[PDB]
Symmetry: C6
Subunit: 216 residues, 6 copies
């Protein structure tokens, strides 16, 4: 990576941490923030390193490649490379494959990221990767948010855990996710607690809803 | 984070330490000082990282979001953003969402924190988070301080452990907590030790109270 | 902490090390040097961090608070704060609560410690804490030094281990501890070895005493 | 290694990490990116270190030596060393054995890598090593891509895992690997899912293919 | 410690390493080089830290105190402190107790070690400690070198291991240890191997002696 | 050690790593590259540290001492120390014992290594140590290369592992080791595979030989 801006190689325990995360948790939603955390300031070389060191899950890793290729193709459409000799004081325009690290050197990647103005190929490629990770996470989620219903003897707290866990893996914008909160959470509660929450009105906090069905 | 003031990415073992803390201890009172300890000099990006890497406990994490949103809304009320072009020498006013890291870049967060005078968005957001963590801890505490009573054969030392453990998780200011100490501790002791402590008078130290009921 | 004088946040494994020490060894005498070791150059913020991250032992932690408050009250008595506007070139007088970190900022704590002449609030508060730790250790020691007596078939070496272990936790100055060595050690040995040591005279080293009762 | 350009010795946990990788995973495809990751900025001395610290697998390590010798011999053919005294301001031409580290000193290796223009002996030798590692991985793969066929009750997702796992270890260029994807994957699926995928047409993504055979 | 010359606090894992060494290996000869290794550049404060963090073994730790006090008393005899006001440009003469760290501050210890000419109180105290450690190791060794005799079916290699292990813990100068090698090793071998070694003559290497009795 | 050229103490986990290597793997060939790896830039003090921290194996450690003494005696023969006062601008000539670290200070060792021209006592002593380590490894190898013969049902790959493992521990130059490869490997294969390899001719690679006897 590059620390704020001097270049550094990816650390053994960063590498190891990422490997263990995928081994232990597969593609559970929290893996993605972990990935981003472990890739702060990462060059495409470091990002590819993290991806390539994953054994197994090669259907997902292939899916991720395609997503990255789609995003790369789109970048090329919007940003066409122009014919001409790259002047002494300047550096060339990056393609999608240069951003994905496959067709660019470490020094070129360092060049784009540090040069003024900054061309953050690390952070661009990272967004493409996270995009592909979301597609995987969402596909690899077994349950739908519509199916999360509170059991008759289930403590509300456990139902809310399942609800927002499943919600975290849903393919939905924030406005849609807002609708799911205000509609489904109360709708799919068990009869006893459902009554209790309906009596609070449709503008009570989760704290208030959780403390309300705490006894029941 | 930023070390005293050069920017740095959050370390693998900081990340891992925070993850294990929540796994092992859930939301026991000591988790909060640990959080603060592990987030010293943290930017909103680093703070969000720590929060987002938590798997499970999504009812609490959602509660935390709402608290953060409430604190954000309050910040906006007190600090209204003004219309105008941000001059070359200056930086824009942060909103609550910029402080919560959701609508601000890493560079902007670095900008506010390092610029003179300092606009410590890291430390502001951290207070909001700790506020929300307290709401969770206090809600997730099973016992009330009123219910902590010494068993007939219970060593005083173990009763005082339970008392100040439960006290640590109570929703109460210091003055109220002072009242609980001077009132309940002696009140809820077992008959034999209760007599002993009453004889010391109402201005004896815990050391004196503990050593007094040490034999009994 | 501050490394010799640039400020730094407390490390994950410092934090973790302190936590494990208390978990594994409770308040055994060696915990205190460990605490001091792990808190070298620590600010009050770092010291409070270490204390607050302890789960359980809240009777002791409360005792420690009172001791710290007593030492704070005493500091205020000897050092009264004066009325007046703090000039541009100067910094305010610290109270006991500023030294205990509860009423002072990190920057103020950094200010006092680095400014010339040095006002070492870190090292002052640390002494108060160690004072309170001793009160706990000594109270939480089950045995008295008077009760350490050598068994009839006990190897002297094991008796000396028990003696100086129990001695380490005693409430006694060095002169009193010197008296205990020269009086009790030989006095409370078993008959066979007691005779042997009496024959050496009252000015023989522990090495000489241990090697003398090595065969017996 | 050399960090961007100051020289450094290879770290204990880099060393250990590489050792454990080979112990745990033998020569599974992901070992190679790990090797490269752990050898970022490595000198030939550091590269030889990593190779020599491997116990066992000495048939492979010998194979690797031969590959390295072949690449070394080829370098010498293309780059013949010229007779003459190396001037004060200059440094000598590296042979293949100098690149492989066997006939060059650490200082010479540092010299070539840092001097302008750069003579990256570290990165050249690394390519030769990775070349030899591929020969081993590919030879040590038990299965052929032609033999990966979906079981009648096998979830497609598991079949795609096996397919792209085995594909990763194949001796094939990208164009050949593209042909294998578009030809064999669908061809060797089980009857029920095979029909489903044929109906999508020959330009559907893996995401679309995987989600299509998700129910079946 | 002080790294070559900037001051630093003792690291968590240095501390922990020393603690585990004593727990696992007690006072086996190799502990002493480990101690010295872990205390490279250590101030008396750091040295006392390492010693004080040892739980158990308090007979030995007390023995060590006495040795340190003896060495301190001897230093004072040879180096008497003179009466007079310490000038602005100078620093005071250290006593034995200042060297042992008990009566000197960290800054004074830093002062003596860094000032020109150097007054290495760290390295002086370290020698006293190692002196006391040897007394302990040698006392705590169960066996004498005279008692190491080769069993009739014992492989010579195992006998030489026992011999030089026991030799390492002996109270003897190098000349005496040389005599033990050339005299006892061959003398105390078993009849079959004893004959073999006598035939080599009295100037053969251990390699030659070990390879000679390898078959037998 | 000294990092490229500022002095540093040997790290806890370097120390620990070396200790574990000897505990786990004794004197298996790969230990030697590990030693060298862990001793990059090491002073004689650091080298002695690593050697002295080994518990057990004292027959080997004694053998190593003798080898070091032999190499030291040889250095003294070739490099005789001259009589005269060492001038202010210069430093003294090192003896073998100064190189082995026994009769030289840390500062002298730093002096020789950093001064121009460089007198690399660290790297000289290291060669002597590795020389002595080879003598041990080779002596402690149970099997001869002549005795490695392929079993009738043994996969060739396992036979080649045993061959080059045993070869690695042999006392032989590269030319002799080349002869062993081209002569014995094929000679000592089992009848079925022996025939197969003879048919390839006497200039086929190990890759070709291994892939040839892969089916058989
Ligand atoms: Cl790869
Ligand atoms: Cl851009
Ligand atoms: Cl997230
Ligand atoms: Cl502000
Ligand atoms: Cl707290
Ligand atoms: Cl003061
Ligand atoms: Cl080797
Ligand atoms: Cl080149
Ligand atoms: Cl102590
Ligand atoms: Cl001196
Ligand atoms: Cl030693
Ligand atoms: Cl030389």
């Amino acid at each position: 990576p590059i620390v704020q801006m001097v270049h550094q190689a990816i650390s053994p325990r960063t590498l190891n941490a990422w490997v263990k995360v995928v081994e232990e948790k597969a593609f559970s939603p929290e893996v993605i923030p972990m990935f981003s955390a472990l890739s702060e300031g990462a060059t495409p070389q470091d990002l590819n390193t993290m991806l390539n060191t994953v054994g197994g899950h090669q259907a997902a890793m292939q899916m991720l490649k395609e997503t990255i290729n789609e995003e790369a193709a789109e970048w090329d459409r919007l940003h066409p490379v122009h014919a001409g000799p790259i002047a002494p004081g300047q550096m060339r325009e990056p393609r999608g494959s240069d951003i994905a690290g496959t067709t660019s050197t470490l020094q070129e990647q360092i060049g784009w990221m540090t040069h003024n103005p900054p061309i953050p190929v690390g952070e661009i490629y990272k967004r493409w990767i996270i995009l592909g990770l979301n597609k995987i996470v969402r596909m690899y989620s077994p349950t739908s948010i519509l199916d999360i219903r509170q059991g008759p003897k289930e403590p509300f707290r456990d139902y809310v855990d399942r609800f927002y866990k499943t919600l975290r893996a849903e393919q939905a914008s924030q406005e849609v996710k807002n609708w799911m909160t205000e509609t489904l959470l109360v709708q799919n509660a068990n009869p006893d607690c459902k009554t209790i929450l309906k009596a609070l009105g449709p503008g009570a906090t989760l704290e208030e809803m959780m403390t309300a069905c705490q006894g029941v």
